[PDB]
Symmetry: C2
Subunit: 267 residues, 2 copies
């Protein structure tokens, strides 16, 4: 019993991390497929009977509660943003991130990050709210990618940020630590750099980048009317789910018609 | 004291429905503006101190709990969808809704409704789950609009639907009724029609359309592999918020950097 590539692909779609089933165990495709179909139907029936919550939606709600309870204001800002935000973010037209932008109409695009909208909120809210200003947003972001096991074209970003007092490296690391401890995810912090922000603190789980974080001020602040110390971090929710559920491919965690909570919908 | 159009616009931005303040009361602009700025800063400070939840996010969470508790599976599907879905939905290239579509790249668009993704889920889930199949989704949808007091280009749709047993007009009306009673919103049902679905039951609050709902089957089902009775309804969350909070302009409820929970962010 040698399986074709098409057969192995079909079994891999139906296989879940908790299965102790090897596709090369010598059993024929028909028996492996029947067993996995039965397991996945049972898994989906259990979700439908007892849970009914989508992993991405449930994780957004859990993260929302965590940040609201710690004094951060919940933001919901536009997903369709001016293309001018990309240039004012310092993303020059010939840079790598600029090629990843999904253009809409003529002057708009799908946001590839939450940062510009949140910078506008920090500036505006600092005229009305007491120091420090603490805000966060969770929602869809978009980048054209080569599509590996760790990138999606449509993903979900969390960005939390603070402006004013308490905007230090140690406070930023403390929030990241409390957040990932709340989710039960081990991590380390490594130095890296990017073009928008300069140096970042990257939050790594093994070789998987969970977040890039920044301690301001940076020279870019002036173009956004930011004139105080700030800290912020952006996390991909699908990457968090990939770690939590041991998914081999991030597509299992994505907005999709092909998987529900990591279970194939082709049953 | 006659106010210019620019001055009146500024005061209208700062005015909230609960204020018993008339912009034509004869008081000068400087006093009306100072009073309203003070009220709105206080309102925002109270939210920041005591609540911190965004109206759109909080309403999504409340609706999610309502449908999950009543046996509907929570869906999060792609916002960027194939342009082919628009033609297979019967939206011919020269129709009115087709002109409202935001195109992305060459073969994709921003979804103007949730229905096609949910039809795919109904079909797929019917192979695995017991009758009846009950699902819902909340999330961003996009339409180019003339932009009045009731339309946004970027809005948030709820669509709940069911396939199999219990897919009758009376059950559909009963779910709509239980849902709007839960939110405390009065309504009536009127007959209307649209091009995708044919006859609809429109859910009206006064002259404001809160939802269009459909009792299947319809001939379009075959193009989506739907072969059982079904019911479904789509609601705009920003319209629900407009009713709940007596907003004069739906922009107060939208994803925005210009308003937070209906309060101007230009303070
Ligand atoms: N295409 C993508 N798919 C899924 N998640 C992503 C994607 N791009 C970024 N993220 C998540 O958003 C976070 C903040 O975005 P950032 O700009 O730092 O990404 P990045 O450094 O380009 O990530 P990578 O180096 O893996 O491409 C990332 O740490 C990651 O968790
Ligand atoms: N541009 C929009 N902005 C905000 N909400 C909308 C918009 N278009 C539709 N909705 C909401 O989505 C629901 C379902 O969409 P549907 O296709 O029935 O809208 P519609 O009949 O085009 O609405 P209208 O007649 O007001 O344009 C509507 O009843 C409404 O609550
Ligand atoms: N690291 C993540 C995003 Se982190 C930015 C936190 N958001 C924020 O409010 O910054 C204020 C700010 C932003 C730009 C210019 C001046 C001031 C990423 O690369 O996608
Ligand atoms: N009235 C709202 C959307 Se209502 C559709 C409910 N969703 C669903 O699952 O329908 C099954 C289905 C859909 C199309 C073709 C065949 C079968 C609007 O106009 O935006
Ligand atoms: Mg990248
Ligand atoms: Mg990186
Ligand atoms: Mg990074
Ligand atoms: Mg319309
Ligand atoms: Mg209508
Ligand atoms: Mg309608």
């Amino acid at each position: 019993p040698a399986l074709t590539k098409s057969q192995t692909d079909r079994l891999e779609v139906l296989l879940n991390p908790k299965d102790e089933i090897s596709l090369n165990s010598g059993k024929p495709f028909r028996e492996l497929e029947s067993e996995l179909l039965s397991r996945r139907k049972k898994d989906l029936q259990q979700i439908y009977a007892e849970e009914r919550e989508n992993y991405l939606g449930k994780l957004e709600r859990e993260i929302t509660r965590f940040f609201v309870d710690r004094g951060f204001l919940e933001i919901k800002s536009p997903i369709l943003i001016p293309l001018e935000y990309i240039e004012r973010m310092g993303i020059d037209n010939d840079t790598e991130l600029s090629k990843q932008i999904f253009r809409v109409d003529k002057n708009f695009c799908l946001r590839p990050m939450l940062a510009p909208n949140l910078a506008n909120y920090l500036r505006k809210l600092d005229r009305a709210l007491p120091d420090p200003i603490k805000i966060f947003e969770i929602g869809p972001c978009y980048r054209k990618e080569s599509d590996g096991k760790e990138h999606l074209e449509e993903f979900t970003m969390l960005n939390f940020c603070q402006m004013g007092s308490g905007c230090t490296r140690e406070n930023l690391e403390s929030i990241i630590t409390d957040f990932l401890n709340h989710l039960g995810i081990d991590f380390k912090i490594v130095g890296d750099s990017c073009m928008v922000f300069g140096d970042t603190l990257d939050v790594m789980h093994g070789d998987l980048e969970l977040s890039s974080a920044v301690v301001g001020p940076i020279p870019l602040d002036r173009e956004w009317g930011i004139d105080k110390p700030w800290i912020g971090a952006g996390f991909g929710l699908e990457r968090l789910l990939k770690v939590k559920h041991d998914f081999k491919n991030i597509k299992r965690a994505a907005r999709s018609g092909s998987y529900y909570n990591g279970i194939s919908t082709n049953l």
